[PDB]
PDB file of all heavy atoms in Angstrom:
ATOM      1  N   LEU A 567      73.352 140.873  94.975  1.00 22.91           N
ATOM      2  CA  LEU A 567      72.578 141.903  94.283  1.00 22.91           C
ATOM      3  C   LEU A 567      72.804 141.928  92.771  1.00 22.91           C
ATOM      4  O   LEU A 567      71.882 142.231  92.016  1.00 22.91           O
ATOM      5  CB  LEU A 567      72.885 143.289  94.864  1.00 22.91           C
ATOM      6  CG  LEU A 567      72.747 143.476  96.379  1.00 22.91           C
ATOM      7  CD1 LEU A 567      73.051 144.916  96.775  1.00 22.91           C
ATOM      8  CD2 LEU A 567      71.363 143.065  96.858  1.00 22.91           C
ATOM      9  N   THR A 568      74.015 141.610  92.322  1.00 26.14           N
ATOM     10  CA  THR A 568      74.322 141.714  90.896  1.00 26.14           C
ATOM     11  C   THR A 568      74.669 140.387  90.218  1.00 26.14           C
ATOM     12  O   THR A 568      74.533 140.262  89.004  1.00 26.14           O
ATOM     13  CB  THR A 568      75.482 142.696  90.646  1.00 26.14           C
ATOM     14  OG1 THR A 568      76.679 142.197  91.255  1.00 26.14           O
ATOM     15  CG2 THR A 568      75.155 144.059  91.226  1.00 26.14           C
ATOM     16  N   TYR A 569      75.123 139.398  90.981  1.00 29.08           N
ATOM     17  CA  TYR A 569      75.466 138.112  90.379  1.00 29.08           C
ATOM     18  C   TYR A 569      74.296 137.134  90.447  1.00 29.08           C
ATOM     19  O   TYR A 569      74.057 136.374  89.510  1.00 29.08           O
ATOM     20  CB  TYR A 569      76.702 137.504  91.046  1.00 29.08           C
ATOM     21  CG  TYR A 569      78.013 138.094  90.569  1.00 29.08           C
ATOM     22  CD1 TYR A 569      78.043 139.264  89.822  1.00 29.08           C
ATOM     23  CD2 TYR A 569      79.222 137.473  90.856  1.00 29.08           C
ATOM     24  CE1 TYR A 569      79.236 139.804  89.383  1.00 29.08           C
ATOM     25  CE2 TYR A 569      80.421 138.005  90.419  1.00 29.08           C
ATOM     26  CZ  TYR A 569      80.422 139.171  89.684  1.00 29.08           C
ATOM     27  OH  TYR A 569      81.610 139.708  89.247  1.00 29.08           O
ATOM     28  N   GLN A 570      73.562 137.163  91.555  1.00 29.34           N
ATOM     29  CA  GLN A 570      72.419 136.275  91.733  1.00 29.34           C
ATOM     30  C   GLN A 570      71.099 136.971  91.397  1.00 29.34           C
ATOM     31  O   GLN A 570      70.029 136.375  91.509  1.00 29.34           O
ATOM     32  CB  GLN A 570      72.394 135.734  93.164  1.00 29.34           C
ATOM     33  CG  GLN A 570      73.548 134.795  93.469  1.00 29.34           C
ATOM     34  CD  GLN A 570      73.823 134.658  94.952  1.00 29.34           C
ATOM     35  OE1 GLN A 570      72.932 134.834  95.782  1.00 29.34           O
ATOM     36  NE2 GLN A 570      75.069 134.352  95.295  1.00 29.34           N
ATOM     37  N   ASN A 571      71.185 138.236  90.993  1.00 27.66           N
ATOM     38  CA  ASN A 571      70.035 138.983  90.485  1.00 27.66           C
ATOM     39  C   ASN A 571      70.473 139.956  89.397  1.00 27.66           C
ATOM     40  O   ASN A 571      70.642 141.149  89.651  1.00 27.66           O
ATOM     41  CB  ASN A 571      69.325 139.743  91.607  1.00 27.66           C
ATOM     42  CG  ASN A 571      68.623 138.826  92.587  1.00 27.66           C
ATOM     43  OD1 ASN A 571      67.539 138.313  92.306  1.00 27.66           O
ATOM     44  ND2 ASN A 571      69.233 138.623  93.750  1.00 27.66           N
ATOM     45  N   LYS A 572      70.656 139.444  88.186  1.00 24.92           N
ATOM     46  CA  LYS A 572      71.239 140.229  87.103  1.00 24.92           C
ATOM     47  C   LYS A 572      70.206 141.024  86.307  1.00 24.92           C
ATOM     48  O   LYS A 572      69.168 140.498  85.923  1.00 24.92           O
ATOM     49  CB  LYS A 572      72.019 139.308  86.160  1.00 24.92           C
ATOM     50  CG  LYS A 572      73.149 138.557  86.843  1.00 24.92           C
ATOM     51  CD  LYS A 572      73.858 137.606  85.894  1.00 24.92           C
ATOM     52  CE  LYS A 572      72.997 136.398  85.580  1.00 24.92           C
ATOM     53  NZ  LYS A 572      72.594 135.683  86.820  1.00 24.92           N
ATOM     54  N   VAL A 573      70.501 142.296  86.064  1.00 26.40           N
ATOM     55  CA  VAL A 573      69.680 143.128  85.191  1.00 26.40           C
ATOM     56  C   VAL A 573      70.459 143.412  83.912  1.00 26.40           C
ATOM     57  O   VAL A 573      71.585 143.903  83.966  1.00 26.40           O
ATOM     58  CB  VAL A 573      69.278 144.451  85.869  1.00 26.40           C
ATOM     59  CG1 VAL A 573      68.457 145.314  84.915  1.00 26.40           C
ATOM     60  CG2 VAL A 573      68.506 144.177  87.151  1.00 26.40           C
ATOM     61  N   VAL A 574      69.864 143.098  82.765  1.00 26.55           N
ATOM     62  CA  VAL A 574      70.592 143.116  81.498  1.00 26.55           C
ATOM     63  C   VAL A 574      69.918 143.977  80.428  1.00 26.55           C
ATOM     64  O   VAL A 574      68.693 144.003  80.315  1.00 26.55           O
ATOM     65  CB  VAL A 574      70.766 141.675  80.947  1.00 26.55           C
ATOM     66  CG1 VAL A 574      71.512 141.677  79.619  1.00 26.55           C
ATOM     67  CG2 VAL A 574      71.494 140.803  81.962  1.00 26.55           C
ATOM     68  N   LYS A 575      70.733 144.688  79.654  1.00 26.26           N
ATOM     69  CA  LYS A 575      70.260 145.426  78.490  1.00 26.26           C
ATOM     70  C   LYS A 575      70.524 144.649  77.206  1.00 26.26           C
ATOM     71  O   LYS A 575      71.662 144.277  76.935  1.00 26.26           O
ATOM     72  CB  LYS A 575      70.943 146.788  78.395  1.00 26.26           C
ATOM     73  CG  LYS A 575      70.568 147.770  79.473  1.00 26.26           C
ATOM     74  CD  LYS A 575      71.107 149.138  79.119  1.00 26.26           C
ATOM     75  CE  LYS A 575      70.656 150.183  80.108  1.00 26.26           C
ATOM     76  NZ  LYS A 575      70.968 151.542  79.596  1.00 26.26           N
ATOM     77  N   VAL A 576      69.495 144.417  76.400  1.00 23.27           N
ATOM     78  CA  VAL A 576      69.710 143.739  75.125  1.00 23.27           C
ATOM     79  C   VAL A 576      68.909 144.369  73.985  1.00 23.27           C
ATOM     80  O   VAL A 576      67.732 144.685  74.132  1.00 23.27           O
ATOM     81  CB  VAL A 576      69.375 142.231  75.229  1.00 23.27           C
ATOM     82  CG1 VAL A 576      67.921 142.016  75.620  1.00 23.27           C
ATOM     83  CG2 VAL A 576      69.686 141.531  73.922  1.00 23.27           C
ATOM     84  N   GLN A 577      69.566 144.573  72.847  1.00 24.77           N
ATOM     85  CA  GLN A 577      68.903 145.148  71.683  1.00 24.77           C
ATOM     86  C   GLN A 577      68.011 144.136  70.978  1.00 24.77           C
ATOM     87  O   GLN A 577      68.312 142.940  70.938  1.00 24.77           O
ATOM     88  CB  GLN A 577      69.931 145.712  70.697  1.00 24.77           C
ATOM     89  CG  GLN A 577      70.625 146.993  71.142  1.00 24.77           C
ATOM     90  CD  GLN A 577      71.675 147.448  70.142  1.00 24.77           C
ATOM     91  OE1 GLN A 577      71.388 147.584  68.953  1.00 24.77           O
ATOM     92  NE2 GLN A 577      72.885 147.725  70.626  1.00 24.77           N
ATOM     93  N   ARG A 578      66.909 144.631  70.426  1.00 26.30           N
ATOM     94  CA  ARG A 578      65.959 143.798  69.711  1.00 26.30           C
ATOM     95  C   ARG A 578      65.326 144.583  68.569  1.00 26.30           C
ATOM     96  O   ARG A 578      64.790 145.672  68.780  1.00 26.30           O
ATOM     97  CB  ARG A 578      64.880 143.278  70.661  1.00 26.30           C
ATOM     98  CG  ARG A 578      63.827 142.400  69.999  1.00 26.30           C
ATOM     99  CD  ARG A 578      62.826 141.875  71.018  1.00 26.30           C
ATOM    100  NE  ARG A 578      61.463 142.309  70.721  1.00 26.30           N
ATOM    101  CZ  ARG A 578      60.793 143.219  71.423  1.00 26.30           C
ATOM    102  NH1 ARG A 578      61.352 143.793  72.479  1.00 26.30           N
ATOM    103  NH2 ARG A 578      59.559 143.549  71.072  1.00 26.30           N
ATOM    104  N   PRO A 579      65.392 144.036  67.347  1.00 29.41           N
ATOM    105  CA  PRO A 579      64.756 144.683  66.198  1.00 29.41           C
ATOM    106  C   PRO A 579      63.240 144.558  66.256  1.00 29.41           C
ATOM    107  O   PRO A 579      62.732 143.518  66.676  1.00 29.41           O
ATOM    108  CB  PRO A 579      65.310 143.910  64.991  1.00 29.41           C
ATOM    109  CG  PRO A 579      66.329 142.959  65.531  1.00 29.41           C
ATOM    110  CD  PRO A 579      66.031 142.765  66.979  1.00 29.41           C
ATOM    111  N   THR A 580      62.533 145.607  65.850  1.00 29.79           N
ATOM    112  CA  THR A 580      61.079 145.569  65.746  1.00 29.79           C
ATOM    113  C   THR A 580      60.680 146.142  64.387  1.00 29.79           C
ATOM    114  O   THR A 580      61.493 146.802  63.740  1.00 29.79           O
ATOM    115  CB  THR A 580      60.392 146.365  66.884  1.00 29.79           C
ATOM    116  OG1 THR A 580      60.523 147.773  66.642  1.00 29.79           O
ATOM    117  CG2 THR A 580      60.993 146.014  68.239  1.00 29.79           C
ATOM    118  N   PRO A 581      59.436 145.886  63.939  1.00 30.61           N
ATOM    119  CA  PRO A 581      58.983 146.457  62.663  1.00 30.61           C
ATOM    120  C   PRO A 581      59.085 147.982  62.609  1.00 30.61           C
ATOM    121  O   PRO A 581      59.247 148.549  61.529  1.00 30.61           O
ATOM    122  CB  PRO A 581      57.518 146.020  62.584  1.00 30.61           C
ATOM    123  CG  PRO A 581      57.448 144.790  63.404  1.00 30.61           C
ATOM    124  CD  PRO A 581      58.431 144.975  64.519  1.00 30.61           C
ATOM    125  N   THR A 582      58.998 148.628  63.766  1.00 29.99           N
ATOM    126  CA  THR A 582      58.989 150.083  63.833  1.00 29.99           C
ATOM    127  C   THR A 582      60.359 150.681  64.161  1.00 29.99           C
ATOM    128  O   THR A 582      60.559 151.888  64.031  1.00 29.99           O
ATOM    129  CB  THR A 582      57.974 150.574  64.880  1.00 29.99           C
ATOM    130  OG1 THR A 582      58.308 150.027  66.161  1.00 29.99           O
ATOM    131  CG2 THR A 582      56.567 150.134  64.502  1.00 29.99           C
ATOM    132  N   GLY A 583      61.298 149.838  64.585  1.00 29.63           N
ATOM    133  CA  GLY A 583      62.634 150.297  64.927  1.00 29.63           C
ATOM    134  C   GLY A 583      63.315 149.436  65.975  1.00 29.63           C
ATOM    135  O   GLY A 583      62.702 148.534  66.543  1.00 29.63           O
ATOM    136  N   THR A 584      64.589 149.709  66.236  1.00 28.36           N
ATOM    137  CA  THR A 584      65.338 148.942  67.223  1.00 28.36           C
ATOM    138  C   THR A 584      65.017 149.443  68.625  1.00 28.36           C
ATOM    139  O   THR A 584      64.931 150.647  68.858  1.00 28.36           O
ATOM    140  CB  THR A 584      66.860 149.024  66.980  1.00 28.36           C
ATOM    141  OG1 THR A 584      67.156 148.612  65.640  1.00 28.36           O
ATOM    142  CG2 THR A 584      67.610 148.118  67.947  1.00 28.36           C
ATOM    143  N   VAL A 585      64.823 148.513  69.555  1.00 29.79           N
ATOM    144  CA  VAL A 585      64.594 148.873  70.947  1.00 29.79           C
ATOM    145  C   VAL A 585      65.615 148.203  71.854  1.00 29.79           C
ATOM    146  O   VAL A 585      66.289 147.253  71.456  1.00 29.79           O
ATOM    147  CB  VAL A 585      63.177 148.485  71.415  1.00 29.79           C
ATOM    148  CG1 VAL A 585      62.124 149.199  70.580  1.00 29.79           C
ATOM    149  CG2 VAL A 585      62.993 146.972  71.355  1.00 29.79           C
ATOM    150  N   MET A 586      65.727 148.715  73.074  1.00 31.36           N
ATOM    151  CA  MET A 586      66.575 148.108  74.090  1.00 31.36           C
ATOM    152  C   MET A 586      65.707 147.494  75.181  1.00 31.36           C
ATOM    153  O   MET A 586      64.995 148.206  75.885  1.00 31.36           O
ATOM    154  CB  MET A 586      67.530 149.140  74.693  1.00 31.36           C
ATOM    155  CG  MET A 586      68.522 148.556  75.685  1.00 31.36           C
ATOM    156  SD  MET A 586      69.844 147.631  74.880  1.00 31.36           S
ATOM    157  CE  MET A 586      70.721 148.961  74.064  1.00 31.36           C
ATOM    158  N   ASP A 587      65.762 146.173  75.314  1.00 32.27           N
ATOM    159  CA  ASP A 587      64.972 145.479  76.326  1.00 32.27           C
ATOM    160  C   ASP A 587      65.709 145.373  77.659  1.00 32.27           C
ATOM    161  O   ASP A 587      66.910 145.107  77.700  1.00 32.27           O
ATOM    162  CB  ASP A 587      64.590 144.082  75.838  1.00 32.27           C
ATOM    163  CG  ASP A 587      63.690 144.118  74.619  1.00 32.27           C
ATOM    164  OD1 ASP A 587      62.844 145.033  74.525  1.00 32.27           O
ATOM    165  OD2 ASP A 587      63.833 143.232  73.754  1.00 32.27           O
ATOM    166  N   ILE A 588      64.976 145.589  78.746  1.00 34.46           N
ATOM    167  CA  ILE A 588      65.515 145.402  80.086  1.00 34.46           C
ATOM    168  C   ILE A 588      65.017 144.079  80.649  1.00 34.46           C
ATOM    169  O   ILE A 588      63.831 143.930  80.936  1.00 34.46           O
ATOM    170  CB  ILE A 588      65.107 146.546  81.040  1.00 34.46           C
ATOM    171  CG1 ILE A 588      65.404 147.911  80.410  1.00 34.46           C
ATOM    172  CG2 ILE A 588      65.798 146.384  82.389  1.00 34.46           C
ATOM    173  CD1 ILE A 588      66.840 148.085  79.967  1.00 34.46           C
ATOM    174  N   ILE A 589      65.924 143.117  80.802  1.00 34.84           N
ATOM    175  CA  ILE A 589      65.548 141.797  81.291  1.00 34.84           C
ATOM    176  C   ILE A 589      66.339 141.392  82.533  1.00 34.84           C
ATOM    177  O   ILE A 589      67.306 142.057  82.905  1.00 34.84           O
ATOM    178  CB  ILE A 589      65.738 140.725  80.203  1.00 34.84           C
ATOM    179  CG1 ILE A 589      67.185 140.715  79.710  1.00 34.84           C
ATOM    180  CG2 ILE A 589      64.776 140.964  79.048  1.00 34.84           C
ATOM    181  CD1 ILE A 589      67.447 139.710  78.614  1.00 34.84           C
ATOM    182  N   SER A 590      65.921 140.302  83.174  1.00 37.12           N
ATOM    183  CA  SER A 590      66.600 139.829  84.376  1.00 37.12           C
ATOM    184  C   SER A 590      66.602 138.303  84.509  1.00 37.12           C
ATOM    185  O   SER A 590      65.749 137.616  83.948  1.00 37.12           O
ATOM    186  CB  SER A 590      65.970 140.453  85.623  1.00 37.12           C
ATOM    187  OG  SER A 590      64.610 140.078  85.755  1.00 37.12           O
ATOM    188  N   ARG A 591      67.573 137.793  85.264  1.00 34.09           N
ATOM    189  CA  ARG A 591      67.742 136.361  85.489  1.00 34.09           C
ATOM    190  C   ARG A 591      68.521 136.127  86.781  1.00 34.09           C
ATOM    191  O   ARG A 591      69.458 136.864  87.086  1.00 34.09           O
ATOM    192  CB  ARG A 591      68.471 135.711  84.311  1.00 34.09           C
ATOM    193  CG  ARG A 591      68.607 134.196  84.404  1.00 34.09           C
ATOM    194  CD  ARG A 591      67.343 133.492  83.936  1.00 34.09           C
ATOM    195  NE  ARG A 591      67.656 132.383  83.039  1.00 34.09           N
ATOM    196  CZ  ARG A 591      67.794 131.123  83.434  1.00 34.09           C
ATOM    197  NH1 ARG A 591      67.635 130.807  84.710  1.00 34.09           N
ATOM    198  NH2 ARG A 591      68.087 130.176  82.555  1.00 34.09           N
ATOM    199  N   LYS A 592      68.139 135.103  87.538  1.00 35.40           N
ATOM    200  CA  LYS A 592      68.784 134.835  88.820  1.00 35.40           C
ATOM    201  C   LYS A 592      70.046 133.983  88.672  1.00 35.40           C
ATOM    202  O   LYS A 592      71.107 134.356  89.172  1.00 35.40           O
ATOM    203  CB  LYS A 592      67.798 134.168  89.779  1.00 35.40           C
ATOM    204  CG  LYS A 592      66.838 135.151  90.436  1.00 35.40           C
ATOM    205  CD  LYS A 592      65.764 134.437  91.238  1.00 35.40           C
ATOM    206  CE  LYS A 592      64.828 133.661  90.325  1.00 35.40           C
ATOM    207  NZ  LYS A 592      63.715 133.020  91.080  1.00 35.40           N
ATOM    208  N   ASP A 593      69.948 132.846  87.989  1.00 34.56           N
ATOM    209  CA  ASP A 593      71.135 132.019  87.788  1.00 34.56           C
ATOM    210  C   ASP A 593      71.858 132.405  86.502  1.00 34.56           C
ATOM    211  O   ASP A 593      71.693 133.521  86.008  1.00 34.56           O
ATOM    212  CB  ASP A 593      70.788 130.522  87.795  1.00 34.56           C
ATOM    213  CG  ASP A 593      69.792 130.128  86.712  1.00 34.56           C
ATOM    214  OD1 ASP A 593      69.858 130.661  85.584  1.00 34.56           O
ATOM    215  OD2 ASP A 593      68.940 129.260  86.991  1.00 34.56           O
ATOM    216  N   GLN A 594      72.648 131.470  85.976  1.00 34.22           N
ATOM    217  CA  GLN A 594      73.576 131.706  84.867  1.00 34.22           C
ATOM    218  C   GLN A 594      74.692 132.663  85.272  1.00 34.22           C
ATOM    219  O   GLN A 594      74.572 133.410  86.241  1.00 34.22           O
ATOM    220  CB  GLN A 594      72.858 132.247  83.621  1.00 34.22           C
ATOM    221  CG  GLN A 594      71.858 131.287  82.995  1.00 34.22           C
ATOM    222  CD  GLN A 594      71.461 131.701  81.588  1.00 34.22           C
ATOM    223  OE1 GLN A 594      71.990 132.668  81.040  1.00 34.22           O
ATOM    224  NE2 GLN A 594      70.530 130.965  80.993  1.00 34.22           N
TER     225      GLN A 594
END
């Protein structure tokens, strides 16, 4: 559930302000 299906929070700058993106990846 958590190692082979990871949900990640990552910050990203935008012209209007900083946002937090919710992304996912199976391997790595």
Side-chain angles (χ1 to χ4, degrees):
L567 307 182
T568 64
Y569 281 13
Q570 292 159 27
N571 291 282
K572 300 177 287 303
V573 178
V574 179
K575 292 190 175 191
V576 60
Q577 288 177 53
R578 180 178 120 252
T580 75
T582 59
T584 305
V585 300
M586 184 75 68
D587 296 324
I588 310 305
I589 57 181
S590 62
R591 184 82 134 94
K592 280 173 293 184
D593 60 38
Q594 296 195 4

